[PDB]
CSV table of all heavy atoms in Angstrom, one decimal:
chain,number,residue,atom,x,y,z
B,25,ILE,N,2.1,36.9,-9.6
B,25,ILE,CA,3.4,36.4,-10.1
B,25,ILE,C,3.5,35.0,-10.4
B,25,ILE,O,4.6,34.4,-10.6
B,25,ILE,CB,4.6,36.8,-9.0
B,25,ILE,CG1,4.3,36.1,-7.7
B,25,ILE,CG2,4.6,38.3,-8.9
B,25,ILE,CD1,5.5,36.0,-6.8
B,26,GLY,N,2.3,34.3,-10.5
B,26,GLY,CA,2.3,32.9,-10.8
B,26,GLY,C,2.9,32.5,-12.2
B,26,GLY,O,2.6,33.1,-13.2
B,29,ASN,N,-2.8,27.9,-11.0
B,29,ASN,CA,-2.7,28.6,-9.7
B,29,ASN,C,-2.3,30.0,-9.9
B,29,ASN,O,-1.3,30.3,-10.6
B,29,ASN,CB,-1.7,27.8,-8.8
B,29,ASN,CG,-2.2,26.5,-8.3
B,29,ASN,OD1,-3.2,26.5,-7.6
B,29,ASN,ND2,-1.5,25.5,-8.5
B,31,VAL,N,-0.7,33.3,-7.9
B,31,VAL,CA,0.1,33.6,-6.8
B,31,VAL,C,0.1,35.1,-6.7
B,31,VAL,O,0.6,35.8,-7.6
B,31,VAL,CB,1.5,33.1,-6.9
B,31,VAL,CG1,2.3,33.3,-5.6
B,31,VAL,CG2,1.6,31.6,-7.2
B,39,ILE,N,2.2,36.4,0.7
B,39,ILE,CA,1.8,35.6,-0.5
B,39,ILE,C,0.4,35.0,-0.3
B,39,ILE,O,0.1,34.5,0.8
B,39,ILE,CB,2.9,34.5,-0.8
B,39,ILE,CG1,4.1,35.1,-1.4
B,39,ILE,CG2,2.3,33.5,-1.8
B,39,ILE,CD1,3.9,35.7,-2.8
B,41,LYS,N,-1.8,32.4,-2.4
B,41,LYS,CA,-2.0,31.4,-3.5
B,41,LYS,C,-3.4,31.0,-3.6
B,41,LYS,O,-4.1,30.8,-2.5
B,41,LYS,CB,-1.1,30.2,-3.3
B,41,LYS,CG,-1.0,29.3,-4.5
B,41,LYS,CD,0.0,28.1,-4.3
B,41,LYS,CE,0.0,27.1,-5.5
B,41,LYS,NZ,1.1,26.1,-5.4
B,55,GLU,N,-2.8,21.1,-0.3
B,55,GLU,CA,-1.5,21.9,-0.2
B,55,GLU,C,-1.3,22.6,1.1
B,55,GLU,O,-0.2,22.5,1.7
B,55,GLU,CB,-1.5,22.9,-1.3
B,55,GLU,CG,-0.2,23.7,-1.4
B,55,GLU,CD,-0.1,24.6,-2.6
B,55,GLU,OE1,-1.1,25.1,-3.1
B,55,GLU,OE2,1.0,24.9,-3.1
B,85,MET,N,0.6,32.6,2.9
B,85,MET,CA,1.9,32.1,3.4
B,85,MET,C,3.0,33.2,3.3
B,85,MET,O,2.8,34.3,2.8
B,85,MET,CB,2.3,30.9,2.5
B,85,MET,CG,2.9,31.2,1.2
B,85,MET,SD,3.3,29.7,0.3
B,85,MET,CE,1.7,29.4,-0.5
B,86,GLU,N,4.1,32.8,4.0
B,86,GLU,CA,5.3,33.6,4.0
B,86,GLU,C,5.9,33.9,2.6
B,86,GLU,O,6.0,33.0,1.7
B,86,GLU,CB,6.3,32.9,4.9
B,86,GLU,CG,7.7,33.3,4.9
B,86,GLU,CD,8.6,32.4,5.7
B,86,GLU,OE1,8.3,31.2,5.9
B,86,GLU,OE2,9.7,32.8,6.0
B,87,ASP,N,6.3,35.1,2.4
B,87,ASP,CA,6.9,35.5,1.1
B,87,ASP,C,8.4,35.1,1.1
B,87,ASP,O,9.2,35.4,2.0
B,87,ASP,CB,6.8,37.0,0.9
B,87,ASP,CG,7.7,37.6,-0.2
B,87,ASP,OD1,7.7,37.0,-1.3
B,87,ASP,OD2,8.4,38.6,0.1
B,88,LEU,N,8.8,34.4,0.0
B,88,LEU,CA,10.1,33.9,-0.2
B,88,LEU,C,10.8,34.4,-1.5
B,88,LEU,O,11.6,33.8,-2.0
B,88,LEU,CB,10.1,32.4,-0.2
B,88,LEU,CG,9.5,31.7,1.0
B,88,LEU,CD1,9.2,30.2,0.7
B,88,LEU,CD2,10.4,31.7,2.3
B,89,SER,N,10.4,35.6,-1.9
B,89,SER,CA,10.9,36.2,-3.1
B,89,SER,C,12.3,36.8,-3.0
B,89,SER,O,12.9,37.2,-4.0
B,89,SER,CB,9.9,37.2,-3.7
B,89,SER,OG,9.5,38.2,-2.7
B,93,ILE,N,14.1,30.1,-7.2
B,93,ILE,CA,13.7,28.8,-7.5
B,93,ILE,C,15.0,28.0,-7.8
B,93,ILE,O,15.9,28.5,-8.6
B,93,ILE,CB,12.7,28.7,-8.6
B,93,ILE,CG1,11.3,29.3,-8.2
B,93,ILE,CG2,12.6,27.2,-9.2
B,93,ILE,CD1,10.6,28.6,-7.1
B,211,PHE,N,12.8,26.7,-3.2
B,211,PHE,CA,13.4,28.0,-3.1
B,211,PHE,C,14.7,27.9,-2.5
B,211,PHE,O,14.9,27.2,-1.4
B,211,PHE,CB,12.5,29.0,-2.3
B,211,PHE,CG,11.6,29.9,-3.2
B,211,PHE,CD1,10.2,29.7,-3.2
B,211,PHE,CD2,12.2,30.9,-4.0
B,211,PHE,CE1,9.4,30.5,-3.9
B,211,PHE,CE2,11.3,31.7,-4.8
B,211,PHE,CZ,9.9,31.5,-4.7
B,220,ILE,N,8.2,24.0,-1.5
B,220,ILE,CA,6.9,24.6,-1.7
B,220,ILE,C,6.1,23.7,-2.6
B,220,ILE,O,6.6,22.7,-3.1
B,220,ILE,CB,7.1,26.1,-2.4
B,220,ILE,CG1,7.7,26.0,-3.8
B,220,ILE,CG2,7.8,27.1,-1.5
B,220,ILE,CD1,7.6,27.2,-4.7
B,221,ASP,N,4.8,24.1,-2.8
B,221,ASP,CA,3.9,23.5,-3.7
B,221,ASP,C,3.7,22.0,-3.5
B,221,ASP,O,3.8,21.2,-4.4
B,221,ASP,CB,4.4,23.8,-5.2
B,221,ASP,CG,3.4,23.5,-6.3
B,221,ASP,OD1,2.2,23.6,-6.0
B,221,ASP,OD2,3.8,23.3,-7.4
B,223,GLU,N,1.1,20.4,-3.5
B,223,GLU,CA,-0.3,20.2,-4.1
B,223,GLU,C,-0.6,18.7,-4.3
B,223,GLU,O,-1.8,18.3,-4.2
B,223,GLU,CB,-0.3,20.7,-5.5
B,223,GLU,CG,-0.9,22.1,-5.5
B,223,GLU,CD,-1.0,22.5,-7.0
B,223,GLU,OE1,-0.1,22.3,-7.8
B,223,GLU,OE2,-2.2,23.0,-7.2
C,403,ADP,N1,6.0,31.7,-0.9
C,403,ADP,C1,6.3,32.3,-2.1
C,403,ADP,N2,7.1,33.5,-2.0
C,403,ADP,C2,7.4,34.1,-3.2
C,403,ADP,N3,7.1,33.6,-4.4
C,403,ADP,C3,6.3,32.5,-4.5
C,403,ADP,C4,5.9,31.8,-3.3
C,403,ADP,N4,5.2,30.8,-3.7
C,403,ADP,C5,5.1,30.7,-5.0
C,403,ADP,N5,5.8,31.8,-5.5
C,403,ADP,C6,6.0,32.1,-7.0
C,403,ADP,O1,5.0,31.6,-7.8
C,403,ADP,C7,5.5,30.5,-8.7
C,403,ADP,C8,4.6,29.3,-8.7
C,403,ADP,O2,4.4,28.8,-7.4
C,403,ADP,P1,4.0,27.2,-7.2
C,403,ADP,O3,3.6,27.1,-5.8
C,403,ADP,O4,5.0,26.3,-7.8
C,403,ADP,O5,2.6,27.2,-8.1
C,403,ADP,P2,2.2,26.0,-9.1
C,403,ADP,O6,1.5,25.0,-8.3
C,403,ADP,O7,1.3,26.6,-10.2
C,403,ADP,O8,3.5,25.5,-9.7
C,403,ADP,C9,6.8,30.1,-8.0
C,403,ADP,O9,7.7,29.5,-8.9
C,403,ADP,C10,7.3,31.5,-7.4
C,403,ADP,O10,8.0,32.2,-8.4
Side-chain angles (χ1 to χ4, degrees):
Chain B
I25 62 161
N29 284 303
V31 187
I39 286 291
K41 188 176 177 173
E55 187 175 26
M85 81 182 84
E86 170 187 18
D87 168 47
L88 305 163
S89 49
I93 294 295
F211 263 112
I220 64 166
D221 197 24
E223 263 188 313

